[PDB]
From a paper:
The genetic fusion of these monomers using a sequence encoding a Gly-Ser linker ensures that the genetically fused pairs will dimerize within the assembled VLP, termed tandem HBcAg (tHBcAg).
Freshly purified VLPs were used for cryoEM data collection, and structures were determined for both T = 4 (at 2.9-Å resolution) and T = 3* (at 3.6-Å resolution) configurations. As such, this configuration was termed T = 3* rather than T = 3, and 5-fold (C5) symmetry was imposed during image processing rather than icosahedral symmetry (I1), which was imposed for the T = 4 VLP. Both the T = 3* and T = 4 reconstructions had clearly resolved density for residues corresponding to the helices of both HBcAg molecules within the tandem VelcroVax sequence. The fact that each fused dimer could occupy one of two orientations, leading to four unique arrangements per asymmetric unit for the T = 4 particle, also likely contributed to the poorly defined density of these regions. For both T = 4 and T = 3* VLPs, maps low-pass filtered to 10 Å revealed additional density above the four-helix bundles consistent with the expected size of the Affimer, confirming that Affimers were likely present but were not resolved to high resolution.
Numbering used by the authors:
A (entry chain B): 1 to 76, 195 to 255, 285 to 360, 372 to 431
B (entry chain A), C (entry chain A): 1 to 75, 195 to 255, 285 to 358, 375 to 431
Write the structure that this text describes.
Amino acid sequence: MDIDPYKEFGATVELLSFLPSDFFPSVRDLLDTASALYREALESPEHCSPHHTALRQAILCWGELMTLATWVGNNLDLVVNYVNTNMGLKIRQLLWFHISCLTFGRETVLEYLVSFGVWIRTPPAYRPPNAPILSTLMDIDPYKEFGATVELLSFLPSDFFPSVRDLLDTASALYREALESPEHCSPHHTALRQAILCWGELMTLATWVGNNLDLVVNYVNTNMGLKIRQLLWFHISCLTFGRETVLEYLVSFGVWIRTPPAYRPPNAPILST
Amino acid sequence: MDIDPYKEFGATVELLSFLPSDFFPSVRDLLDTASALYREALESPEHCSPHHTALRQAILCWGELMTLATWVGNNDLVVNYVNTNMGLKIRQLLWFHISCLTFGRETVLEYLVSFGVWIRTPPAYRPPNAPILSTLMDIDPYKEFGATVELLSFLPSDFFPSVRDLLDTASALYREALESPEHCSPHHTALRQAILCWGELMTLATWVGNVNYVNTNMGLKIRQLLWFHISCLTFGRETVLEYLVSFGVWIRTPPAYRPPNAPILST
Amino acid sequence: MDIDPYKEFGATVELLSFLPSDFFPSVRDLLDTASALYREALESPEHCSPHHTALRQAILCWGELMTLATWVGNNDLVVNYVNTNMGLKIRQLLWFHISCLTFGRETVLEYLVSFGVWIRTPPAYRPPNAPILSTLMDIDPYKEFGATVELLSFLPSDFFPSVRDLLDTASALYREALESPEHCSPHHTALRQAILCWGELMTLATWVGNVNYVNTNMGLKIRQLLWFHISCLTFGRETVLEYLVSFGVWIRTPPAYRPPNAPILST
């Protein structure tokens, strides 16, 4: 799947390439800006916007990118300036786009990307002195806006969830025409596009540790692979079975696992359509 | 899952830390006050209050702590540990529910603020009279819920899942209401006390291990309490009560006169 | 500009001089009483009272006094000076606002008159019980006003004028209401406490000078508080809050991608 993170919001990757690489603030400057203004809505049990759904996933994706980044530094700073060049640059553009579309409006940021493009394409002998400005003058749960918890997702066994290869094959076989659509179509589609993109960022970083500096691939499939297996399984199943069905299946299969085998139905529950 | 024993009753642990540890009457003095005033209601087939429910589980939890304490003294250094750690938290819980039954709940919350003002005062300006509250037993744990100990006595010991598996089912399904400042049911009140009763029972057992026969005497009793209140929240009370009737007919029937599959609780 | 900390709350300094200096509970005893009773309201995005506002600035001022006191002990003679002079005035301010939240404001003013009658009595006719009040934590200073510490963290250290220049702007524009016996706004209440907090901070610094790193740790924090409340009185709160948004976009933009002039707060 070639999924654009900006396509459902009316932008593309090449449209945000109009701003230079050093236009964007640091991740600390942007994560402080989100918590200064949207910390009560980014931790709300509501969707509230597609921009809030896409911002919650990018905040959790950077934490998993930085969990792997410090772990390689303990178990081999050459790893961390590669993250700031490749993965952290994509995080900074994605954080900047959603924070400023919340602050200023999505049409305003799309008008501004065009206006800054005309300004930066001007040669410096004819460029105006003032650039265009956009001025109008935190622990997140990935499942909370969908009615679940990390506690309810871990209520099921660790080895219950299918492989990350089988889930990306399922999303490609069933939702490739909608995950690559320029529409939102659901909050499940928004949270699933970011999960597919974030797994590509970690799989880019994990093979870079493997080629340059192979114990890291076992670690990412234990901690970050299990978290992406539950995240892919949750949103795929809520698309094909419904969100209320998957929430009741989590407490049906969970109590069935806890029940002694002599006093439960003999076969495991399953979701079927 | 961190449960406050007083959050549904308008207080906190930090509000009852205003009173000192030696303020509270002994367990024997508090159980006599309960027996003399509230015995036909604490042995009643009614709920009668959320205070009556929380007091019933607290009297029954002290009996399991004393049964565990009198055993490990046969197999007095431990009784100085029970009275300092587990007997003190029972004494705060027994005092709180007797006093909110005798004086009302808003009187005890107001008395907690007033005793805090008295205890924070330096002694040159603190009056000699401390504030006082003046202006106004065999318990079955299941009897207020329609069941009995004898009705649940037919379920074998391997029917129930682990205490860990029952504390995960409570936390994955009901944590939002077990840590709520509401009551929400008498099944939630009884479930809050049983989780804290297991926490007092476990810290005694890990301390005397520095032995796990508690998993056939006290852990079995906790497992039926944890099973009964989880199931009555999941399936409903009348569904669980009529399942316990039909399971008992099955388990009293000898083999070759019953179907080889036990009844299943669902739907 | 001489500000009475209790004039908007119906009292004076001379009325709280009826109580002796050793009457008041310790700072640790008073902060636990605030934490146990008023923490979801003292960490709330609401005002909820003028007493809640004055209590928030007093808890945050004691933290800056203790940060200044624990530094100069590394570079215990000063802690006997803080507890005698600055810790005593905090203890009167912490006691007054906790007690007017717990018992009401008219009860505390009546208790101050009654304790004065008791303390003036000669000891042969003074009763043994002193009068008592019986009948009924990480704070953000800007959170009740719509801002945060992180929102004001983008303004550089040279944005703000001097503490002297900010105390003259308050005195030349708002002295008639900062010395009034009214509240007039939550911005006036917070401004009264910050001017008195700087006075307690400065007398400690001139005493330990008989060193001015307070102008990059504590004077910087006072300068943002003095700037924010003066500007929200001058320009309005929503004008200042949307200026802080637009200034942050400007200061996060690197040079050669922003206009070379910062946004100006006016109109």
